[PDB]
Swiss-Prot record, chain B:
Known outcome of mutating G2S: In OLMS1; gain of function mutation; results in constitutive channel activation
Ranges that cross the membrane: 1-37, 70-105
Compartments where found: Cell membrane; Cytoplasm; Lysosome
UniProt lineage: Eukaryota, Metazoa, Chordata, Craniata, Vertebrata
Biological function: Non-selective calcium permeant cation channel. It is activated by innocuous (warm) temperatures and shows an increased response at noxious temperatures greater than 39 degrees Celsius. Activation exhibits an outward rectification. The channel pore can dilate to provide permeability to larger cations. May associate with TRPV1 and may modulate its activity. Is a negative regulator of hair growth and cycling: TRPV3-coupled signaling suppresses keratinocyte proliferation in hair follicles and induces apoptosis and premature hair follicle regression (catagen).
Organism encoding this protein: Homo sapiens (Human)
Membrane topology (Extracellular): 67-69
Homology family: Belongs to the transient receptor (TC 1.A.4) family. TrpV subfamily. TRPV3 sub-subfamily.
Non-traversing membrane segments, not crossing the membrane: 41-66
Binding site for Na(+): G58
Gene name in the database record: TRPV3
Expression across tissues: Abundantly expressed in CNS. Widely expressed at low levels. Detected in dorsal root ganglion (at protein level). Expressed in the keratinocyte layers of the outer root sheath and, to lesser extent, to the matrix of the hair follicles (at protein level).
Shown residues in whole-protein numbering: 572 to 685 of 790
Protein name: Transient receptor potential cation channel subfamily V member 3
Subunit field text: Homotetramer. May convert from a homotetramer to a homopentamer to allow pore dilation. Interacts with TRPV1; may form a heteromeric channel with TRPV1. Interacts with SNX11; this interaction promotes TRPV3 trafficking from the cell membrane to lysosome for degradation.
Disease the record associates with this protein: Olmsted syndrome 1: An autosomal dominant, rare congenital disorder characterized by bilateral mutilating palmoplantar keratoderma and periorificial keratotic plaques with severe itching at all lesions. Diffuse alopecia, constriction of digits, and onychodystrophy have also been reported. Infections and squamous cell carcinomas can arise on the keratotic areas. The digital constriction may progress to autoamputation of fingers and toes. Palmoplantar keratoderma, non-epidermolytic, focal 2: A dermatological disorder characterized by non-epidermolytic, abnormal thickening of the skin on the palms and soles. Focal palmoplantar keratoderma consists of localized areas of hyperkeratosis located mainly on pressure points and sites of recurrent friction.
């Protein structure tokens, strides 16, 4: 076992003379795979040399290759891979490509290194992005993700390689580049340029149409992961070269100054197939650049067209129907002992709302939907109100007396539910998101601290009274009345210690009125400013969600009639004017 | 004083109208909710809305014994209205008007 | 090619009164002045506008369908924001100096405005 | 010197001493951080915890946590091997101890009140 240790030490050090002497000794002993391979990680001498490259690593690699050729085992060592369960599939070519050593990488490729080798180690495809490095389980994918234009070009020019190869995750080079790309618009973006280069070199639609085990194209994957730059590049791509214009998705018809007419492609962008880019970017809950992705063609124009076609009319009809239903419920309950018809309409609409909300909840995602403000609270409240109405009707049919309580809770909830319909106008959607953010941020914490202090002081006060502060409930009611500003502060409460009672009351007043309320004012002011800086995006997202829901609600024949697009593929003609861009371009 | 006049105008045109509108919405909703379950003071809709307004502005007394069929439910509705209006809406209007005041000042 | 066409006898005073050219909204179309001279002025072509001005068959007091002349068109095309590079003001100055008359700044369109 | 830097609150010198790598022969012993393997963004490093871990009477972590006359405490605490050490020490037993103390004090207060 000393010979293998000496070989490994010489390879790590890089001493040419020592390595030559050790190789001569090994040849004399032979006159090799077991001595060259280490069982610690299933590596080899070439892998050890490449992992610990030095200023004289090229000479050591050449000597090792010459020794392998002399022993006629080079082809046996070219396919050598890690036997460990952590980084299985690693090869000398993979290590050389990772270490950016282009000369050694090209030498290995010319020597017959495996190009289509798949590195399916568990660490390579970790469940979390921070738990490992994912590049594509392919030397080509690693060269693409590590920004090596020369190496990726040399691999592409090779004949034994392939482009349509799918790794364990099912992702190809384009999917891997999409995953590796950065959502933030950095100063230097190499992923987009090299994606363009690879797509142009491929010159086929098979790369952009292949789906992995998740059933997503590269465009859909970019939309799901939230990469605004790559999404915009793929959606608006123009090629002026002959025989390559088919790869483009946007064709400029005529240009006259700032006015420009462009035909876009709506293959996977329109809400036609089962999964679409627009649906993905609207219904995504684990992304942050939703507004950036939605504010680009052909999504903005498509959304406005889909709105103005039928969504405005559907929203107004729903508003009118719900308003009439609430008015009928309120009148019917208030005029408690024309009534029969109103009750029948209320029951029918309550059943319809209940079943629709049940289907919506069943079809909704059960993960992260309630945690985020993805229009789930309104669905829950609508379902609860419908359940309350139907329960009140059922109890009134019977001889129970809780129907009045159910009905009054129903009117309260229904009249508080009209705010959901204030998202149609921009001036009130900001107000609705303000309500939501403020309540979810500050009111809950302020309230919690309030009941803590209130219960503490209530049990403190109710225990030393041998008048009004008789029991715990009476004491807490009096404390609440003093806090909200009603009643009178009577110091003579038949207490054993009047001075102590007054001290406790003044301490509570200072803690609540002076500190807590104005503190809540300040915190809510800060929150209001912060999320009013970012409310238009939330309003636009809510409007887009409503539009898509109404579009999905449409029947089969109405969807075909409203399907707008001119065949050329389903191209859409968009006329755009960019006066600022035209002026900046012409001022040069 | 011209700054003060434009302050009046901008604040009223921006925030007071929306706050008021939400206020009548919630106030009428809770008034018809309260006036329907009373078999004292909350007799009719007008009396109920007047009592709610008085409780909001800070006058009167919060009497829990209002001859209601469900005293616990009546108290729960009253506390919910108090939390919605006094705790949330008024201080929210303060914050919004502060932001508007800075912006148009 | 523009100079070649001008030397070949192309119409200089030709008026382009297309509906898209004078749209009701500024975002519904591109308005330059319905004149090759006005287009050269609005598109920042000093050489071409100078070649047109030096020509004898052209005119300066021409009024388009909107009644606007070159100065009115330049005013309409100009940007309110103070950009880093402002060519409209400099070329307005150049055109006014080359004209050397008060008729350009005193003519009123159908709106009755200088 | 390391403890003195931690006491005086010098984030730059503290970070340099805590994460020091030397690639020269016969001088690697002076280093306190050794990189085992690197693959893109993933990197494994062995750090030294001679005076950093809360083992001796006085330690760098205890000094930088209990210091009251400094202002860069957050800057000094947000660097290796202090951040990982703190999270490890938390997740080992501190969360359980905190929850146990919470439950015990809550039950004591409830008993006193009742
Ligand atoms: C919410 C907590 C409610 C606790 C139950 C409660 O009110 O019990 C009261 C007893 O109070 C306690 O046990 C103390 C509550 C301390 C809460 C601290 C937080 C008495 O109720 P009663 O019989 O109506 O009083 C005469
Ligand atoms: C600070 C705490 C102040 C408490 C305080 O003032 O308690 C006074 C006396 O306090 C006590 O009896 C308890 C002393 C508690 C000390 C706590 C120190 C901490 C109330 O007056 P009284 O003697 O109960 O009145 C008798 C009838 N006139
Ligand atoms: C402003 C709405 C005024 C509605 C008319 C009104 O007060 O009618 C009351 C009936 O209330 C309703 O119809 C419910 C109003 C709901 C408003 C929701 C927003 C009864 O008036 P009265 O005869 O004085 O009550 C005894
Ligand atoms: C949360 C809603 C809480 C409502 C609540 O506490 O209602 C209590 C009972 O509620 C009801 O009767 C209606 C139940 C409505 C459940 C709604 C769930 C949503 C009021 O007490 P009471 O039984 O009417 O009092 C009888 C005389 N002592």
């Amino acid at each position: 076992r000393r010979l293998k240790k000496r070989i490994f030490a010489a390879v790590s050090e890089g001493c040419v003379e020592e390595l030559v002497e050790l190789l001569v000794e090994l040849q004399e002993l032979c006159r090799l795979m077991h001595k060259l391979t280490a069982s610690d990680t299933g590596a080899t001498c070439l892998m050890k040399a490449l992992l610990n490259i030095n200023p004289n690593t090229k000479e050591i690699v050449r000597i090792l290759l010459a020794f392998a050729e002399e022993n006629d085992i080079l082809g046996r060592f070219i396919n050598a891979e890690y036997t460990e369960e952590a980084y299985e599939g690693q090869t000398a070519l993979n290590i050389a490509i990772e270490r950016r050593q282009g000369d050694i990488a090209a030498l290995l490729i010319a020597a017959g290194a495996d190009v289509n080798a798949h590195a399916k180690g568990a660490f390579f495809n970790p469940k979390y992005q921070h738990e490992g490095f994912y590049f594509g389980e392919t030397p080509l994918a690693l060269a693409a993700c590590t920004n090596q234009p020369e190496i990726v070009q040399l691999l592409m020019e090779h004949e034994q390689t392939d482009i349509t190869s799918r790794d364990s995750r099912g992702n190809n080079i384009l999917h891997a580049l999409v995953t590796v790309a950065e959502d933030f618009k950095t100063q230097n973006d190499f992923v987009k340029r090299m994606y363009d280069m690879i797509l142009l070199r491929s010159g086929n639609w098979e790369l952009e149409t292949t789906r992995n085990n998740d059933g997503l194209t590269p465009l859909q994957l970019a939309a799901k992961m939230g990469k605004a730059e790559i999404l915009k590049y793929i959606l608006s791509r123009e090629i002026k070269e002959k025989r390559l214009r088919s790869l483009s998705r946007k064709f400029t018809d005529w240009a006259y100054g700032p006015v420009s007419s462009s035909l876009y492609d709506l293959t996977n962008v329109d809400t036609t197939t089962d999964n679409s880019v627009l649906e993905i970017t609207v219904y995504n809950t684990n992304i942050d650049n939703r507004h950036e992705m939605l504010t680009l063609e052909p999504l903005h124009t498509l959304l406005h067209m889909k709105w103005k076609k039928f969504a405005k009319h559907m929203f107004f009809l729903s508003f009118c129907f719900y308003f009439f239903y609430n008015i009928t419920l309120t009148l019917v309950s208030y005029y408690r002992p024309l009534q029969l018809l109103g009750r029948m309409f209320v029951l029918i609409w309550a059943m319809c709302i209940s079943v629709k909300e049940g289907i919506a909840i069943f079809l909704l995602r059960p993960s992260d939907l309630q945690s985020i403000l993805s229009d789930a609270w309104f669905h829950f409240v609508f379902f609860i109100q419908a359940v309350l109405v139907i329960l009140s009707v059922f109890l009134y049919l019977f001889a129970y007396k809780e129907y009045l309580a159910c009905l009054v809770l129903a009117m309260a909830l229904g009249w508080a539910n009209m705010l959901y319909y204030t998202r149609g106008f921009q001036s009130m959607g900001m107000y609705s998101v303000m309500i939501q953010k403020v309540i979810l941020h500050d009111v809950l914490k302020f309230l919690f601290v309030y009941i803590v202090f209130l219960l503490g002081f209530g049990v403190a006060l109710a225990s030393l009274i041998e008048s009004s502060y008789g029991s715990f409930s009476d004491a807490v009611l009096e404390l609440f009345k003093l806090t909200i500003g009603l009643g009178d502060l009577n110091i003579q409460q038949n207490s054993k210690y009047p001075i102590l009672f007054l001290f406790l009351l003044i301490t509570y007043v200072i803690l609540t009125f002076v500190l807590l309320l104005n503190m809540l004012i300040a915190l809510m002011g800060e929150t209001v400013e912060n999320v009013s800086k970012e409310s238009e995006r939330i309003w636009r997202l809510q409007r887009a969600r409503t539009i898509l829901e109404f579009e999905k609600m449409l029947p089969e024949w109405l969807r075909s009639r409203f399907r707008m697009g001119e065949l050329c593929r389903l191209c859409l003609r968009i006329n755009e004017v960019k006066w600022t861009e035209w002026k900046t371009h012409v001022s040069f």
